């Protein structure tokens, strides 16, 4: 028997906090402004808070059965809602596992061991075409190893969830320690630029121009990289000879300097240079030549309503506190307080991190997303106090642990759906090992997660996860609303602060979020969502 803290509040903090806060929150604050990102996080936290209130009403209605969240949802709501919500949350869990192991592999390939990942080509576009294949092969390897270890060592991972959560909370503590200690002695982070273009200092040092005085008349290492020859006047690029070089102080301390700079959105295109406003730059207007030059070039084009689909997995995962409802003591009291306090905690964390990222990191550093301008390091790791080597290993361990947790929880939930004869076409996934864990569902989960991982892009596998979780939350909200609306013979919720209009407002809210994220998926998603509903 467990209580309130370890029973509910820690698993929610464990599975909510994940890869996005470490790998894409800074890029999101950079591409949009502080205001747009504020609006994004307000929406994505309001939908989850309203869904949590409705789910707490479910949790306090009646005698909650023991087991997972599916038993609660099925017993309280109708059976057909149970199957639809279970299918949606199952697909969400497996695609979230795909995204989490993708984040693990991205960390390992990009930040820790760059002298790795053999599957590469030597061409300007060859790297952009071979990164996907390299991430695909490492993804297949990691998924296979993950399924193998979760098929054997199930008694190992549950004792390791404590270590995973300790690692991620230590990472958050380090980020706050850095953002507080930057007020007295900010670090000396150099970022070099020609004006409205900035350079990726992976290779060179001392970004000053032609002659650093060793004897006074030797070319800079940067000079050779732009110019054809290591000599003066060796037919260098015209943009190099028109514009000057300078060095800006990346990550200034949080004092009145950059908050007004990073305020409004930019919404750059794909392939354009990352630009700093204010500095003077003359144009050329006859040549671009972006291939082999050390300019940092952007990722996929950034417009609003795409950042919603990138960001939303950062706030999801609230069905975890309702996962261990069998082993609680007075679960109807533990769940509605623990879940809502968890969402309040994570929303406070995200709002604080946004308002601090807007006010400490330079706006040209924010749009890096790969650390190409900070000597190939991590930007949020360079923000931390002791060393960036704690944040990279922290995110590595936490993301690998979250992936293990998803690959543990999704097959058990699929097995619990299949045991009930709600789906007669999929009864075969009811066989399990004599110990009691599922075996045949694990194959299907690993296969669906591989189908997810073959897309091999964290920025285009996140919207699928977002749409699935939005559909699940919308179904739960609509179910509670219409249940208390039609005054069903068995719907007696005992939660104090629960209306019929509050769940309706949540339903409409993340309906608008789904419609604003991607509408082309939304059409056929709502089409099949109604179609699976009538079959039962
Ligand atoms: C390279 O960086 C320097 C900043 O150190 C800038 O070039 C600077 O440009 C200004 C404006 O043309 C120059 O000032 C002028 O200076 C002369 C010097 O006698 C003065 O008589 C004029 O009244 C005027 O104030 C300044 O000398 C020059 N500094 C240099 C070359 O070190 C500029 O930001 C960059 N140059 C570019 C983009 O061409
Ligand atoms: C960084 O420096 C460049 C180099 O001067 C500047 O580019 C300026 O960017 C604006 C907005 O993209 C351009 O404006 C628009 O240009 C089109 C081109 O025909 C014109 O038809 C529109 O009416 C509008 O004025 C501007 O031409 C361009 N100036 C240049 C290239 O000399 C700007 O300071 C920075 N680049 C940005 C913000 O993209
Ligand atoms: Cl959830
Ligand atoms: K999450």
Author numbering: 117 to 652
What does the paper say about this structure?
KCCs are important for K+ and Cl- homeostasis, including in establishing low neuronal cytoplasmic Cl- concentrations critical for inhibitory neurotransmission, and in volume regulation in many cell types. Among KCCs, KCC4 is most strongly activated by cell swelling and high internal [Cl-] and is uniquely active in acidic external environments. Here we report the structure of Mus musculus KCC4 in lipid nanodiscs determined by cryo-EM.
To achieve the highest resolution reconstruction, the nanodisc density was subtracted and particles were subjected to focused classification and subsequent refinement. The resulting map, at 3.65 Å overall resolution, enabled complete de novo modeling of the transmembrane and extracellular region of KCC4 and includes two partial extracellular glycosylation sites, a bound K+ ion, and a bound Cl- ion. We conclude that the monomeric structure reported here corresponds to full-length mouse KCC4 with flexible and/or disordered terminal regions. A prominent feature of KCC4 is a large extracellular domain, unique among proteins of known structure, extending ~35 Å above the membrane. It is formed by EL3 and EL4, which pack together and cover ~2/3 of the transporter outer surface. In KCC4, residues in EL4, TM1, TM3, and TM10 form an electrostatic and hydrophobic interaction network that seals the gate. The stronger of the two densities between TM1, TM6, and TM3 is modeled as a K+ ion. It is surrounded by electronegative groups contributed by backbone carbonyls (N131 and I132 in TM1 and P429 and T432 in TM6) and a tyrosine hydroxyl from Y216 in TM3. The second site, between TM6 and TM10, is modeled as a Cl- ion.
